[PDB]
Ligand binder design. Structure first.
Ligand SMILES: NC(=O)c1ccc[n+]([C@@H]2O[C@H](COP(=O)([O-])OP(=O)(O)OC[C@H]3O[C@@H](n4cnc5c(N)ncnc54)[C@H](O)[C@@H]3O)[C@@H](O)[C@H]2O)c1
Ligand SMILES: NC(=O)c1ccc[n+]([C@@H]2O[C@H](COP(=O)([O-])OP(=O)(O)OC[C@H]3O[C@@H](n4cnc5c(N)ncnc54)[C@H](O)[C@@H]3O)[C@@H](O)[C@H]2O)c1
Ligand SMILES: O=C(O)c1cccc(C(=O)O)n1
Ligand SMILES: O=C(O)c1cccc(C(=O)O)n1
Ligand SMILES: O=C(O)c1cccc(C(=O)O)n1
Ligand SMILES: O=C(O)c1cccc(C(=O)O)n1
Ligand SMILES: O=C(O)c1cccc(C(=O)O)n1
Ligand SMILES: O=C(O)c1cccc(C(=O)O)n1
Ligand SMILES: [Eu+2]
Ligand SMILES: [Eu+2]
Lengths: 418, 409
């Protein structure tokens, strides 16, 4: 009957709004007072079209109340962030999840369900959540239910995505699985995949890992192809004609998300068993410097120091500068003497970011494309008129419009310039 | 028209037979006299089902002649081996390809086509083959045509695949591509992908690389999952529900093949190192199963890399068998219906008679539907399936795979 959502960001706030929309009494919990003040003043703390309207209905119905403190509840959902650890492997930091678990503990009653929606390293539910709960007068699958249901939201379609997506319900016990289904049954029309907590954890991280290792492969191949005057993009397209070959696209590096590596067991106790993952991460981490070295060479062959960075985010059409290879390049270029850097991103609202394109491209020798923003797809020679040299090095292969005055380069043909 | 095929193995001999079957005058060239004597006596030097029959027709028609020496021809196809160098990568050795090229050079005439079917590192056609030919006065795309046409056939289906498989025609010039198409149009019904030589070389290296790195990922994940008491197979099936996630299947290793790089490539190297470590990982797991049980006898099921194929070359399954054979305190016995050898035991029942563990290393069709009746002679009815091939559910036999071996310990 009552649900507490701990963490009111991109995951937690729409989720709280969703259960409250279906008649559940929801208490939204966040440690950020600025967030709580915004919410208590009737405004959503996140940027999502149409959500403000839904929030207004739900706030007025008295179904969604907010606080900096948890309170007694039937269901608790942890949707706090899992920052990236300062380590090679890029392990998920479970510290905010454990801090959030400790806020919930004094309010725990028999029959309660704890759902962890945040990204967690494999064996977190079993080896970290379970011992803490069992330390209190509790038995998992009997007194309380422990579910890991990984939450992943599609921006622009968050609420629809929350209803129609297939969902993984990872219970510690078979009883926990049933408790998880009970919770989501409220609005989830999508399929509910039943499994244990460790399988749910491992699976989501394996998705991230397949993607990282494959991007590392593409990036490593780009370096090889550039050395041999081979077009990497044409060869990936060629090789992918094999039904079981799916080579990924290269880029300026990898950001956001964390991998299938627990900080302890497979780093501190058996690291040679995560050798491929480590190598993949090393290759992806080296791409900002590879882009910078390529930039330095373009700027050497041309008159000028001005490089205009286009995009400071990892994903396109997102305002997230957090753990961004595009920002890493900008900062390296800024640090670098003999290079005058100017960032352009329509999605990024920072002070230092140039808001106008024409002003940003003004007297620049090179336009550096580091994000695949929709705006960058349809760019004509008209946009680059103010440049000292009309040259583009696109690390994302986003520009789909052909030019004449402007010299356009990919990872596929950058070797032609040098 | 006349064609010379240099190197008469699994690639060259069927290719020789194929062009001659279509009316081309073919000279098969091989440096091995034993091979030439076998061929000249009327017998194929290679093991492939109905090939002997097609060889007999073609030899009698006078369309396929063999020799240890090349002779003047319109087309030359190099199908010699590219052995593994030593080398931390076990990179492709281009030496036999270059030697084959050197043996053809004195016979070269204006208008000739040189096709390299052998595995070659990117830029071989452009930086190694082209300079040698141009040194003779020949102009590529004008008086000599240079093509890389990587050949890849499935044993048992060799002649069928030569016709029906799609083909990459990698010409040094656009004229070279046209010359390559005229050669293969003789019998190729499959699609002919037109591209330049460097794209054909790189594309072949990228296919094997995507495959190896991904198998390495699956195998590395299996080691991680086993350490955390997580089922790897269930997790791959779970994760692969994502439309852009295609995690491969783990196994006992990969059928060894040279890396077509010129002797950073750090990821590629690591991937091959992980796959090479799988035979020892399987052996270490086997040693632990045999420790917990009474007995020394382990029955290997499958000695081939590919299921339902005579794939014993650089086979990980075969490598495990020999490691188990070498290992004292372990009595190994191999069972494979597809492989005929001096050590391949009496048809199943006698191979299991007092064994404490059945180790499945190949995904043969026969291994899918398997009753308890088959293992009725074993000292301990236990199965460790490194391929996840057994689909027939059974009682009294303890079935283990990569996903649950941590349960036995
Ligand atoms: N956004 C996604 O679709 C996405 C995708 C995959 C995984 N995830 C997982 O979910 C996590 C959170 O995602 P998000 O985008 O909503 O992050 P977010 O930063 O937008 O929101 C997190 C919120 O939780 C609050 N918070 C932090 N610690 C707290 C605590 N101890 N108690 C109560 N509130 C606390 C923060 O103040 C912030 O408002 C991610 O870090 C990841 O683990 C998110
Ligand atoms: N078998 C395949 O489908 C496969 C797959 C991918 C690539 N390849 C490439 O093709 C190569 C050959 O494959 P294979 O399986 O036919 O090898 P193979 O060993 O079966 O046949 C090679 C034959 O060439 C002969 N030979 C060696 N050097 C020669 C020379 N200098 N002049 C004339 N003849 C010579 C050898 O005596 C041998 O008979 C491989 O090493 C690899 O480069 C083969
Ligand atoms: O299935 C996906 O890849 C996915 C799903 C939701 C959000 C995102 C994302 O934000 O990248 N990605
Ligand atoms: O969590 C994700 O969004 C994810 C994981 C692997 C691949 C992809 C993808 O291709 O979008 N996305
Ligand atoms: O459409 C998507 O789901 C998407 C697109 C780009 C990146 C990702 C990702 O990283 O998950 N996901
Ligand atoms: O497309 C493939 O994977 C393939 C094609 C032909 C032969 C072989 C083989 O012999 O392994 N593999
Ligand atoms: O050479 C091959 O047989 C090959 C190369 C890449 C992928 C695959 C495959 O998925 O079978 N096979
Ligand atoms: O049927 C095939 O092509 C096949 C089967 C198993 C392995 C491979 C491979 O490694 O290419 N290819
Ligand atoms: Eu995605
Ligand atoms: Eu294959």
């Amino acid at each position: 009957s009552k649900l507490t959502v701990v963490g009111l960001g991109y995951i937690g706030l729409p989720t709280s709004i969703m259960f409250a929309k279906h008649g559940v009494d929801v208490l939204g919990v966040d440690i950020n007072q600025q967030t709580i003040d915004k919410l208590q003043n009737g405004q959503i703390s996140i940027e999502e079209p149409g959500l403000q309207e839904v929030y207004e209905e739900v706030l007025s119905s008295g179904k969604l109340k907010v606080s900096t403190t948890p309170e007694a509840s039937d269901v608790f959902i942890i949707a706090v962030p899992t920052p990236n650890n300062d380590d090679q492997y890029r392990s998920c930091d479970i510290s905010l999840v454990m801090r959030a678990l400790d806020s919930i503990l004094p309010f725990l009653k028999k029959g309660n369900t704890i759902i962890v929606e945040s990204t967690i390293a494999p064996k977190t539910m079993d080896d970290f959540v379970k011992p803490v709960i069992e330390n209190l007068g509790f038995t998992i699958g009997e007194d309380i239910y422990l579910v890991h249901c990984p939450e992943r939201v599609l921006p622009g379609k968050i609420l629809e995505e929350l209803v129609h997506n297939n969902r993984i319900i990872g219970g510690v016990t078979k009883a926990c699985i049933e408790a998880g289904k009970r919770v989501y049954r409220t609005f989830v029309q999508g399929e509910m995949i039943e499994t244990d907590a460790r399988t749910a954890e491992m699976s989501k991280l394996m998705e991230n890992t397949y993607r990282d290792v494959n991007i590392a492969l593409a990036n490593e191949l780009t370096k090889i192809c550039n050395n041999l005057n081979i077009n990497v993009l044409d060869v990936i397209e060629m090789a992918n004609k094999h039904p079981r070959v799916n080579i990924h696209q290269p880029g300026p590096g990898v950001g956001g998300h964390c991998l299938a590596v627990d900080p302890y067991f497979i780093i501190a106790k058996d690291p040679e068993n995560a050798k491929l993952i480590q190598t993949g991460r090393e290759i992806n981490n080296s791409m900002p410097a590879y882009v910078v070295d390529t930039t330095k060479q373009i700027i050497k062959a041309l008159s000028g120091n001005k490089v205009t960075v286009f995009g400071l985010t990892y994903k396109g059409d997102v305002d997230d500068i957090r753990e961004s290879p595009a920002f890493d390049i900008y900062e390296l270029l800024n640090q670098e003497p003999d290079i005058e850097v100017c960032a352009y991103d329509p999605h990024v609202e920072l002070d230092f970011v140039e808001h106008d394109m024409s002003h940003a491209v003004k007297d620049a020798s090179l336009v550096l494309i580091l994000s695949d923003h929709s705006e960058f797809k349809n760019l004509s020679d008209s946009h680059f008129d103010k440049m000292k040299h009309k040259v583009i090095f696109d690390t994302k292969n986003v520009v789909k419009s052909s030019f004449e005055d402007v010299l356009y380069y990919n990872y596929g043909n950058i070797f032609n310039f040098i």
